[PDB]
Amino acid sequence: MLRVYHSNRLDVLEALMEFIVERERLDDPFEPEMILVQSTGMAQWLQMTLSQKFGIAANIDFPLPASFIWDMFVRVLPEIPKESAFNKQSMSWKLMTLLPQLLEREDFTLLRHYLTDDSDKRKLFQLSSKAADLFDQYLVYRPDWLAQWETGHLVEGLGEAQAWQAPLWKALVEYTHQLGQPRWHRANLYQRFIETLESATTCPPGLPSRVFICGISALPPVYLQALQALGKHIEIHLLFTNPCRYYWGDIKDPAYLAKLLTRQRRHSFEDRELPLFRDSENAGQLFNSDGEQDVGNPLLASWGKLGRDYIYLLSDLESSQELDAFVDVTPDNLLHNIQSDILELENRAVAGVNIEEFSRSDNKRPLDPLDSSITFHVCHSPQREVEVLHDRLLAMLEEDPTLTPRDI
Amino acid sequence: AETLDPLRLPLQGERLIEASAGTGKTFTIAALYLRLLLGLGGSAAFPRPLTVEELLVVTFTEAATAELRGRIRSNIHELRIACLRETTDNPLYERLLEEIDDKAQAAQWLLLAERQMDEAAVFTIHGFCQRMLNLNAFESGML
Amino acid sequence: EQQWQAIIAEGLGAQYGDAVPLSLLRDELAQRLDQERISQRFLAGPVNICTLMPMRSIPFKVVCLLGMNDGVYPRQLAPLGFDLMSQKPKRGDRSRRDDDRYLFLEALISAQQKLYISYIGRSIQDNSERFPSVLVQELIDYIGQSHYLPGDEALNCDESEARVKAHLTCLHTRMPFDPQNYQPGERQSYAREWLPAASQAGKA
Amino acid sequence: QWEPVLTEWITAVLQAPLNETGVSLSQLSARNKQVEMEFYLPISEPLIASQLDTLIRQFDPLSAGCPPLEFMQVRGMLKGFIDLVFRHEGRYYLLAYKSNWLGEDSSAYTQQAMAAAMQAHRYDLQYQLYTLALHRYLRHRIADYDY
Amino acid sequence: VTIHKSKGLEYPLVWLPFITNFRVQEQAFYHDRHSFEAVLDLNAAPESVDLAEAERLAEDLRLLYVALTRSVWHCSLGVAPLVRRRGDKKGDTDVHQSALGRLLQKGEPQDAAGLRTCIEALCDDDIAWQTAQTGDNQPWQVNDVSTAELNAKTLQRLPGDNWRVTSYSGLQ
Amino acid sequence: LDTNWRSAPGMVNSVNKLFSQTDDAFMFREIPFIPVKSAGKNQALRFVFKGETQPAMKMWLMEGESCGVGDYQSTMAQVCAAQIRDWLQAGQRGEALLMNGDDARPVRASDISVLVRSRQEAAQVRDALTLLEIPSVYLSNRDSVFET
């Protein structure tokens, strides 16, 4: 069972992780606890909060999502090396050898005009590094393109660069077939990894008891389709921070809108069913013809496109369990007003479409002049900017008696 | 020579605008930017409306490009407000509002322009040349 | 030695047979030696000074933002031109512009008590107006269209928006020894070393 | 040239058992071993050296000499990196590595010289914090835990 | 502010004391009147010198227009019978070799009295002239005023307690 | 663009009178000059003195038959400094004003600007203006701070 934990802030997710660890203890003490993070400061803050909550924080592994996915590839499917043969530097050094061999082809006349003018083996290495970075991005994000390029068939609807990218990739796959290096990579393995977990009867050995995903707000659909097959057997708790409590993503089809309407979240402690949309009868009028929801808040619609795609990718999972733990914020300050307008998904920006809305101004929210929550400062130089910032931080430390510089 | 109207300029082929000293050149550039964004002019209009990432503005001085980008952003916000309210205090903005028949689609296009103003193609000469050399490096032969 | 042997091992893992020039290895070593970044003192207890890192949102009481002028933020990375992911975008695609906008959204949400935003508004060279980023401009537009001051209860919509945006904007002085900073009121400078210089009570 | 002496020195270290019953390192499986355990230890009280060194000297027998170090009041988190933790016959054990050893060349490294090195390098506080971290980890992980 | 640095700016009152000062270009680097390409003549041919001096005079006229069109309320010009030639009294002045004298004297070589009559010919309500009088009475008046009282804030307590995340090496 | 929104109509008429004396005043056939039109909202801009309304363009003709370069520069710098100190002396008493319709504004030190071409005559203007206790800034100063 894959559990999804929607929350407004990260302290509620840390308390939920504390309740999950204190509720279910690990049967193997030396088994490391996999918590997936993106940066080192996120893992450091998670270690500090778990040490402050439990009294200790040890044997907690913080790998990359790609490293954890390759480790699960090694543990589930055998005959796989510990390191991937298809890396950025390895594909760059392979393509630096393969690109002069492919200059005789007719499809590589553009690279021949780019390379054979003047080359002291500098443009070739930069081209190989950029093409290896693009091939790594194709290994992460676009496995069907590489799967069709390995056969030799083109994809309809792409650009002109595929005309030099399709024979370059396939001759790479033969090249590692020519050497002693293994064949397997990230693209061709994920489908067999998904199929071998659904087709299996018992759980494979070597898998961890529970995996946490905290601080990660962006994942490819390939990684989510692998993690769904992992969550079918082993309980994986997903901690995702979303600023809005309602549904603020996109839609695919009207047959998918009813499937999203049938799915309802439930609270962790209150245990009450809560719907996604604020209005169920008017939920069809919010989405456009292409499938984009007309969000009333312009800041959430203009800034959080990555989270808008990520909540649509999370809602697309079939066996996902969605739990919502949102702590409401009382709108008293300006910053709390902004956070309440984002969380409650309402539009407080008064346009003034009529003359009665344009003449009166008391229909907006009152802002006290002593409210120093959100301030905008205009500076003249980078020295004077942080010189003003130091004085303002000293004023904030003098105004609040209980204020830690670690919290700044 | 002929006089220049910002709402009657045919945006086809090559046109040469001679803006004298002291004239509102920075206002005329923003007016033509709004004209290219909304697709106005009728018979002398563009065949299709263009986005923010397709309008190229070339000015040599970098502070002039920053001031022009800020003025174009302010004009986009003012025209979005005047299109949402169907009224304005400027006569050129009044003729701009009178030239369009639809109000919701123009307001949505101006909102998308306000959201995509960060990715605007308002560069200098050498900046645009460096961007074209780095983007299409195959035909040029640039590192 | 470790970086040089790592470069040679990554080259020999592909079994490179042709000759390799010296300048390419020199540029590769210069790129690899400056690739490292340190984050050991990120949350040691002193106040954190760091750049915006993607997919990292931590709740704090006071969140300050520097360099929010236009051109600097959001950090724009031009595409390669021959990449096929930029031509046909999908759902799970990631770009640096959307990552920076989501980082600004996470910085707005993650602020608990106080949010500070500072940008270069006036040029130090020619005293030219430097416009801020589009995110901060949309933020102050939403503030001016969603809030009003109690002094002007019902005056106008645009005038109240301009009055709110002028009340929030604190245009600081160009020099630290200016006496406007030491004027008693809402803001006052904490620099005791520049107090007799700003008071103008010294001998020539 | 150091390699054929290095491999036989490594096998001579691994063949030597380090336990009160005589358990070697080759009897530890991969599930039992845990290398480089990183821990964070919280402390909310102001860490006074005078109130801590007397409590250490009350129980630790190696604190007969070793005049106390001077450090400021530390309130917050403490980082630590244990080298090896391994279980055997239902009993946990901690193992650390020290490898400087510049001043000895003969067989004089007896228990007295090692105790003098522990008192000089002040590894007693590190070992006591390691025991506290392992006690808190075994209390948090295994329910109904006895030290 | 120089003439090149005043392009696009705005000033209420503008004074141009050295608008009659000109410079003669010596090198022969011009542009063709048909192909519109840069022609550099390394030989000392007088035709190339005249064709470069024509472009120099056009650049001086453009500088004159740029310097004149920045004033809003009032502009003042300094006109004088400047002679670039080393002769003291030759009967002719070189103001026609400048940008202002090409518009005042209508592109004709004249004298100081001829330049004065060309100035006095185009007299309207907006265009006037006066003589240059050398004299000084008093420099200025400061009119100073007393500065307002001010003080600096003092931090009452410590900014933060001794919070640090250390290791064993930090405690040794 | 026919309309001019910056300057007063007197300065616009002075420019259209000076540059349209002959045909092709810029001496090139492909650069034509046209009479520009002033703005309707700025038609009441008047720089008034204590005596009467000062005209737009005032060509200060230096008296003499033939003069040098440095003496002419020094005399015109002294005349410009005298005009600056006269506009600042009468400007602080409410005599010399900038009037837009009924609105009036006193002339401060930032209003008067001297347009030079080189650095030598700029330093000459700065010295001849600081001789009469008038501080002046140089916007076109591109000198390095490491050379002082």
Swiss-Prot record, chain A:
A helicase/nuclease that prepares dsDNA breaks (DSB) for recombinational DNA repair. Binds to DSBs and unwinds DNA via a rapid (>1 kb/second) and highly processive (>30 kb) ATP-dependent bidirectional helicase. Unwinds dsDNA until it encounters a Chi (crossover hotspot instigator, 5'-GCTGGTGG-3') sequence from the 3' direction. Cuts ssDNA a few nucleotides 3' to Chi site, by nicking one strand or switching the strand degraded (depending on the reaction conditions). The properties and activities of the enzyme are changed at Chi. Changing R142A: Acts at variant Chi sequences. It comes from Escherichia coli (strain K12). Changing L134A: Acts at variant Chi sequences. It comes from the Bacteria. Disruption phenotype: Decreased degradation of DNA with free ends that is unable to undergo homologous recombination, which can fortuitously lead to more efficient viral infection. Cells are deficient in DNA recombination repair and have increased sensitivity to UV light. The cultures have many inviable cells. Cells can be transformed with retron Ec48-containing plasmids. In the RecBCD complex, RecB has a slow 3'-5' helicase, an exonuclease activity and loads RecA onto ssDNA, RecD has a fast 5'-3' helicase activity while RecC stimulates the ATPase and processivity of the RecB helicase and contributes to recognition of the Chi site. Belongs to the RecC family. The holoenzyme may undergo conformational shifts upon DNA binding: the nuclease domain of RecB may swing away from the DNA exit tunnel in RecC. When Chi DNA binds to the RecC tunnel, the nuclease domain may then swing back to its original position (that seen in crystal structures), allowing it to nick the DNA 3' of the Chi site and then rotate to load RecA. At high Mg(2+) the nuclease domain may swing back more frequently, explaining differences seen in assays performed at high Mg(2+). Heterotrimer of RecB, RecC and RecD. All subunits contribute to DNA-binding. Interacts with YgbT (Cas1). (Microbial infection) Lambda virus GamS protein interacts with the enzyme without displacing any of the subunits. This is RecBCD enzyme subunit RecC. Changing D136A: Does not act at Chi. Changing Q38A: Acts at variant Chi sequences. The chain holds residues 1 to 408 of 1122 of the full protein. Changing R186 to A/C/H: Does not act at Chi.
Curated annotation (Swiss-Prot), chain D:
It comes from the Bacteria. Mg(2+) binds at D83, A96, Y97. The active site is at A96 (for nuclease activity). Disruption phenotype: Decreased degradation of DNA with free ends that is unable to undergo homologous recombination, which can fortuitously lead to more efficient viral infection. Cells are deficient in DNA recombination repair and have increased sensitivity to UV light. The cultures have many inviable cells. Cells cannot be transformed with retron Ec48-containing plasmids. Heterotrimer of RecB, RecC and RecD. All subunits contribute to DNA-binding. The C-terminus interacts with RecA. Interacts with YgbT (Cas1). (Microbial infection) Lambda virus GamS protein interacts with the enzyme without displacing any of the subunits. Belongs to the helicase family. UvrD subfamily. The N-terminal DNA-binding domain (residues 1-929) is a ssDNA-dependent ATPase and has ATP-dependent 3'-5' helicase function; both are stimulated in the presence of RecC, suggesting this domain interacts with RecC. Holoenzyme reconstituted with this RecB N-terminal fragment has no nuclease activity. The C-terminal domain (residues 928-1180) has weak ssDNA endonuclease activity as an isolated fragment. RecD probably interacts with this domain. The C-terminal domain interacts with RecA, facilitating its loading onto ssDNA. Interaction is decreased by ATP. The holoenzyme may undergo conformational shifts upon DNA binding: the nuclease domain of RecB may swing away from the DNA exit tunnel in RecC. When Chi DNA binds to the RecC tunnel, the nuclease domain may then swing back to its original position (that seen in crystal structures), allowing it to nick the DNA 3' of the Chi site and then rotate to load RecA. At high Mg(2+) the nuclease domain may swing back more frequently, explaining differences seen in assays performed at high Mg(2+). A helicase/nuclease that prepares dsDNA breaks (DSB) for recombinational DNA repair. Binds to DSBs and unwinds DNA via a rapid (>1 kb/second) and highly processive (>30 kb) ATP-dependent bidirectional helicase. Unwinds dsDNA until it encounters a Chi (crossover hotspot instigator, 5'-GCTGGTGG-3') sequence from the 3' direction. Cuts ssDNA a few nucleotides 3' to Chi site, by nicking one strand or switching the strand degraded (depending on the reaction conditions). The properties and activities of the enzyme are changed at Chi. This is RecBCD enzyme subunit RecB. It comes from Escherichia coli (strain K12). The chain holds residues 985 to 1131 of 1180 of the full protein.
